[PDB]
Design a protein around this ligand. Sequence first.
Ligand SMILES: COCC(CCO[C@H]1CC[C@@]2(C)C(=CC[C@H]3[C@@H]4C[C@@H]5O[C@]6(CC[C@@H](C)CO6)[C@@H](C)[C@@H]5[C@@]4(C)CC[C@@H]32)C1)COC
Ligand SMILES: COc1ccc(CCN(C)CCC[C@](C#N)(c2ccc(OC)c(OC)c2)C(C)C)cc1OC
Ligand SMILES: Nc1ncnc2c1ncn2[C@@H]1O[C@H](COP(=O)(O)OP(=O)(O)NP(=O)(O)O)[C@@H](O)[C@H]1O
Ligand SMILES: [Mg+2]
Length: 1199
Amino acid sequence: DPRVTEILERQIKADSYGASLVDLYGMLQGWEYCLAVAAYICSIVAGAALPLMTLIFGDMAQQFTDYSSGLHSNNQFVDKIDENALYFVYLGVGLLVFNYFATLLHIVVSEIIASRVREKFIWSILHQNMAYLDSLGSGEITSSITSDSQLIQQGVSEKIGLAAQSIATVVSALTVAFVIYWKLALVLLSVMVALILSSTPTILMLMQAYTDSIASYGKASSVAEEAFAAIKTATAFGAHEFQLQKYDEFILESKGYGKKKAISLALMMGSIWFIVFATYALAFWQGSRFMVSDNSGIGKILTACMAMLFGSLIIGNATISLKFVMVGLSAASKLFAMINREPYFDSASDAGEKINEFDGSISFRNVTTRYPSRPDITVLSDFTLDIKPGQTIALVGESGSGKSTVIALLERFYEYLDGEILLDGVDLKSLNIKWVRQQMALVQQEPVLFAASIYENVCYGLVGSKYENVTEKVKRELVEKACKDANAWEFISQMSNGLDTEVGERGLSLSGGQKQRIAIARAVISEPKILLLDEATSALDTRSEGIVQDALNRLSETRTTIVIAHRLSTIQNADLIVVLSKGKIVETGSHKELLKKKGKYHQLVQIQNIRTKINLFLMLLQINKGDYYLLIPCLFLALIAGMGFPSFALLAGRVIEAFQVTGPQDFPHMRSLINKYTGFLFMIGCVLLIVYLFLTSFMVLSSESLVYKMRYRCFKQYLRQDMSFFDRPENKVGTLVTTLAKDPQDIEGLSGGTAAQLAVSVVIVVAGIILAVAVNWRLGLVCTATVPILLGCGFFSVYLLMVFEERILKDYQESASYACEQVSALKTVVSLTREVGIYEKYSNSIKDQVKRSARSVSRTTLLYALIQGMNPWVFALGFWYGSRLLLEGRATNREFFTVLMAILFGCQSAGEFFSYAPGMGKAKQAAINIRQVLDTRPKSIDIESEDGLKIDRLNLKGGIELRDVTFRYPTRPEVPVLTDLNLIIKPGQYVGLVGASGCGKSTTVGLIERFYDPESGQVLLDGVDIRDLHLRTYREVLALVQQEPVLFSGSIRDNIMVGSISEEDMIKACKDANIYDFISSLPEGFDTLCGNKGTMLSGGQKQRVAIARALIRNPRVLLLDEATSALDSESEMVVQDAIDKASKGRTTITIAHRLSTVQNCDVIYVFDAGRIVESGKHDELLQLRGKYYDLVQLQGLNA
Ligand SMILES: COCC(CCO[C@H]1CC[C@@]2(C)C(=CC[C@H]3[C@@H]4C[C@@H]5O[C@]6(CC[C@@H](C)CO6)[C@@H](C)[C@@H]5[C@@]4(C)CC[C@@H]32)C1)COC
Ligand SMILES: COc1ccc(CCN(C)CCC[C@](C#N)(c2ccc(OC)c(OC)c2)C(C)C)cc1OC
Ligand SMILES: Nc1ncnc2c1ncn2[C@@H]1O[C@H](COP(=O)(O)OP(=O)(O)NP(=O)(O)O)[C@@H](O)[C@H]1O
Ligand SMILES: [Mg+2]
């Protein structure tokens, strides 16, 4: 027990890992480290040189004020201005150079790190033991290959460079502000820190609201998942409003939390602007108060104020960039957990022995095995067997005996706890695993061919052979010979290219017969010593089976072979047959020997013989008409913003002019002016605050509303679709749930909030331009011509960042798809030992991709650096022109700084709208997908349409008639299920539809319920076609009891009343279902929760609840689609008691696999390939000695 349990956990134990940036940045080797260092240095420099613009602005402001006061001569003013303009030019050039190098080197280093991570991941995944790989959920490895490596690459991409730039900018801004003027900087820092620690409550509230909304939509998404999975039951019982009301109850909680989200976002975005203008006014006021003692001047006050705000504003950029770093580290924590895990079997190394002159003899001695997933069941117990060279052995038995467990033990996929497996007397645990797998050839039931030429697919089996590295002509001859010996040359010659044709997604797609023969050729070409045939003809068509079986027999006449045959006629001439029952060998010997013993083999042969004998924005705005009451004020607060920012610029210009003091004699007057305007700069600062407290709020509210509708309607548009919509491969339950999660959420980027923000930004930009032109037309015209440049730069910074974000995902697609292809077929890869070749191909692909990607990036990084450096040049031109204007008297210091602050506000307000650009990158896509979903309408089976003859209960006879019905499943229209089916149920008949499996007897339920319409033919209820009846009332007449009982999450009373068409009909139905006793025995009454929690119920009680649900509506036609073909024998009797009572008094159509139930049917119909072969009662069918007789004999033997 201790050793066994330790082995079973160690085979599957996935140890966790906590990754950091040390692990990610240690992927560099040697001279690559310098690149990383260089990148960071550049980033830091590109962040430290940015707040020097505040220094140069302060110096130019001081020069302008001094010249206006009359302190210095024209020549001095011109020379100083020109020197400051040169300083802007130098700063712009430096910003360009360092931004280029920082971005390029960060991207290159991220490419290198992620490529190393990808290589290590694929190498590690390929060489894990199969037990761990099976444990990994479906699609986990492919998601780690495709969508977890991009996150790692982003975490160390230019995003971390921008985070470092933001931190450096904050540090440098604080340093500049404290070095130039420390007293005012200290006062401003104290006030800002106080106002931030005072806004910590609002941030906490916003994060809480986000978390609560996420949880509420998680509950809503669980309701959506259960409805889609149980869409048949909901369609049959008309539970399309019940599911929608359970969904709407949870997407109305998300709206309630979105109202807190809106309030918190409005408060936070108002606090951020309160800090801005409060600091501005306080800086100017306290600087004037300190000037009466320091003579600091306007320059130092402006430098300190600008540096403080600059530093604070960039804190937001650091947080957004650091989000990517945190997400990347979490993805690394995942990928490094798997990369570091050591496999249970050391197949990567070359440790082990290699048998020379391998004969091909195998020996199992008391082999015992328990799978790691289920450590309590012994799948294989005391397995003993000896296979001499040349002996073809056959493993037979019922499903779950453990036949494929022997092959899994041989191939080292799983570990055997006790016993001993010997290859020519050498223990299997002391042999090289890759060599062991090379000495065998595994031919599975489902053949896997990879996306390559048939020549390459066949050569995939030459790994580790003596012919692995030979001249290509010898390889071509070998492939030709192997394809001839596999009966594959015949159809290969027919194809145009021949051996070079590409079998895979791209190129021709072959039938199982061709794919299986190519797999046989790939197996034979290696000349194996042991052949493992695991049902190589199980899924094959009967006609194809002949050619392939011939190939398999010719292959296996001369090698040690272990045949697991689905058809026992193929293994009659096997040298030895072993019968397995629950992992134990019951008998072994020749065909004639076992038959004379009349044991399990005799029964299996008899059953086989019997079976053989029987056989865009305006659209969403129009949808959300409610936003019309959130767009009447938003065009009035915008007007207020358009009259508040120009006023703010005017006041700022007046305050700067007030500082034109020649000496200490002007300090009193200045102070008075400073005071007065600083009052207005507050009174107009608060008004705008109020606007933000409303405006942002409305934005978020609007968005929330839209999302809610885009959820509700979308769900209401999925429940409307007919079953053919849900049969399509794309419309999986998980896919539809993910679409409901994503698209309604993502369409929030083109809501009324975006329109309001765009309108506000446009109004502010236009108001700034108008104010600048009115104040001084000579200056406003240049401001009008610099604003297009200053806005394009701000937009294209975001656009190029988006391009950098998209490149990572769009570039590693030709290579991630290859890895997902070779990993989705991982047992085939492992058994061929194609692990090294796949590693070499994938590594070469991504190594080429790195070199391509660096040169791809450099071109865009050039433009990004140019845009980043553009701003100081614009400021230099503006200041030079302004100084030339003050020279000629055509402008005033007040007018110049009013224009400057106006264009500053315009560019800061238009940069709020550009941050919406990434969102509209996805929202647009979402919008078009949602429009298709809303427009999707079922062809004929529509529940919402009120067109059709309604049914009258008084005249409702309840008879059914399928007249000349033929039907094909739309997914596979080639294969017919029903052909020319003529069938009649008279009213009140208890009819049973028995038949061989695959006869399409269960499709009659779908046709009567009108899940589908017949391709050609008619279905009539009481002489009236069902296509002319109202679907809702028709389905209310019917009732359905499915094979596996479905109970939607909720109380027992709710599930039982789903089929209600008074609290006493429900009791009566529960009594008729023999379930009321169990209900009264529950801790509570009918309020007990069943779905997904509460008192769990057995299959019998679930089926009885389903029967009561069907019974409440008092149906005239009860459709029992194998209501007991899921129950154990003991439970089946009470469920059958419930079923028999329901049949009395109404038309009942029972499809049953256990023909004991249908023994009391008035008329029994037997199906065969979709047509009614035999009809009549039980005794007459028995006397007929036909297909029903064979079925009852088969059921008697099968047990
Ligand atoms: C699951 O959660 C998902 C998440 C939900 C929202 O999370 C919030 C977390 C806090 C965070 C990052 C958010 C918005 C504004 C951010 C603030 C701006 C302020 O600016 C400063 C500096 C400048 C000052 C003037 C004002 O204060 C900072 C101290 C303040 C700040 C950086 C503190 C952190 C805030 C988003 C994202 O969803 C898209
Ligand atoms: C022109 O291109 C851009 C220009 C500026 C920006 C920066 C965006 N700003 C940080 C938005 C500031 C928002 C904010 C408000 N309200 C604000 C701050 C300062 C402002 O003037 C100094 C301001 O004027 C409206 C607004 C604060 C809440 C932060 C980005 C740009 O591209 C994304
Ligand atoms: N990876 C696994 N983890 C746990 N149990 C497993 C695993 N694989 C198979 N089993 C169970 O082990 C038993 C034997 O499985 P298996 O060896 O596949 O039998 P089989 O006779 O080859 N099946 P079949 O090919 O359908 O006739 C059954 O109970 C299986 O459900
Ligand atoms: Mg099997």
